[PDB]
């Protein structure tokens, strides 16, 4: 079973990539749960993570650098909800595009990735319940997972990737 993200326009098969990281925003305000969404920032947030490869992408790092042994999370200031949280994976997650308007990701591999991310965030914020929620909104490039490939620019709705609760 897989997670099938709608994309426009249709990414061709040679644009399938390896998700190597992602960038999150921690929701503000105040239940002992901590909520994360794909970043509400912009290109400055993405560049300062310093784990991207050559592909320009939002929300997810494609074909970037991998951590050595386990997931690593970093932030310029954990107490500032306006600073994004950089998540660098240790084993990549493949995202295969069919050329028909969708790119697919294994549900079990994505769930196991989110569990490791949740665990690292749990140790950083000393919480108990980590909740991933969809983008709060924004321009098409940032509310979607967007990325360039072969001179073309593609937009994939990512709401299915960020919708889980982890204890």
């Amino acid at each position, epitope marked *: 079973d897989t997670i099938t993200l709608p994309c426009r326009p249709a990414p061709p098969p040679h644009c399938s990539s390896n998700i190597t990281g992602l960038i999150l925003t921690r929701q503000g*305000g105040y239940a002992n749960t901590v909520i994360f969404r794909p970043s509400g920032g912009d290109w400055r947030d993405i560049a300062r993570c310093q784990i991207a490869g050559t592909v320009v992408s939002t929300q997810l790092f494609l074909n970037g650098s991998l951590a050595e042994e386990e997931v690593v999370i970093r932030s310029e200031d954990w107490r500032d909800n306006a600073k994004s949280i950089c998540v660098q994976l240790a084993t990549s997650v493949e995202i295969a595009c069919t050329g028909a308007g969708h790119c697919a990701i294994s549900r079990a591999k994505w769930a196991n990735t989110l569990k490791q991310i949740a665990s690292k965030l749990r140790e950083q914020y000393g919480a108990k319940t980590i909740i991933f929620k969809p983008s709060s909104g924004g321009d098409p490039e940032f509310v979607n997972h967007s990325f360039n490939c072969g001179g073309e620019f593609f937009y994939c709705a990512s709401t299915q990737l960020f919708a889980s609760t982890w204890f």
Partner: antibody
Amino acid sequence: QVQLVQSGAEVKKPGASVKVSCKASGYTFTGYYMHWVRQAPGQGLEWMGWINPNSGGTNYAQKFQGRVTMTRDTSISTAYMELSRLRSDDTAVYYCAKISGSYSFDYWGQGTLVTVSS
Amino acid sequence: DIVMTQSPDSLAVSLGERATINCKSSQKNYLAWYQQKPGQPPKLLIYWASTRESGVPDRFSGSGSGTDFTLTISSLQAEDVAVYYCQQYYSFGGGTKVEIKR
């Protein structure tokens, strides 16, 4: 000179929505986050959320998630705060405020009084 | 997700005397202090806990580190009557209303 000019006072019925605007001049509008803060009469300052004017990304206070929407029109350097499903205890002065590099609010709008009443 | 509490809620100070406002966090220090008068937005007085904004008179000073911070008005003038707020990241303290003691 930096100035944030907000729209005029509004009287709304409970259950309606209000949209407050905040027009910025004197600085690069997309270079600094805009925050919204409200103040019920006689009470303190309550943070509502921020918007990144460059991308339109937002981060709302959990209290207002699903009720507030923050947008901006960069061609006219104007930020907007829409609050829907109004209750009487949303009666407050609503401020836009521009964060600085020292993470303080050096410039504020003059405030927009929103009165919710039947 | 950090709560800033201010004490007291209200402070009566005799003219020309010292006023001390406390701000404590519940968990470089990014504390800022604001002064609010009726019908106006808050006005920034101090940032980085102790740096005075341009134009702010020398009788205003901030200090503190870590968890406890203080705004001091060394010699209260009538024009200093107002509500004062501290701020760390995007949490504000509850406000301290400063009035003249007679």
